[PDB]
Amino acid sequence: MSIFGKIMSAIFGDSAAASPGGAQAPATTGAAGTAPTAPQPTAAPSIDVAPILDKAVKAKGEKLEWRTSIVDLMKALDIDSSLSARKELAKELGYSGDMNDSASMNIWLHKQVMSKLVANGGKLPPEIKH
């Protein structure tokens, strides 16, 4: 499969009314009816991936660094990260497994995946750029 297209189905799939700064705090009701009700939809031509992955990472359970590590953001959306997963994602991008080992694998893969990911309207924090 194509994991860059598998992870984006969650990143570009925010419909829980969370978004960057959209989550509100619940309040008690009853006599509380005093409040305006004019819900104008919040459009988003830009998909801020930062308040998506930063939260998804700690939702996964362990603290990761999606900012640099490609395997971290992958596992965060809950991908196998095992042999089959690392094989499909890499081979869809071109695959490089000669002497580079996992060392250059984290680097190169992180670059290519982002080019297929944030190109769909994804907005990244100012330090995530190739």
3-state SS track over the chain: CCHHHHHHHHHCCCCCCCCCCCCCCCCCCCCCCCCCCCCCCCCCCCEECHHHHHHHHHHHCCCCCCCCCHHHHHHHCCCCCCHHHHHHHHHHHCCCCCCCHHHHHHHHHHHHHHHHHHHHCEECCCCCCC
Backbone φ, ψ for residue 47 (5° rounding): -105, 100
Count of Cβ atoms closer than 10 Å to residue 62 Cβ: 9
Which technique was the structure solved with, according to the deposited record?
A: NMR
List CB contacts of 67: < 8 A, sequence separation 6 or more: 125, 127, 128
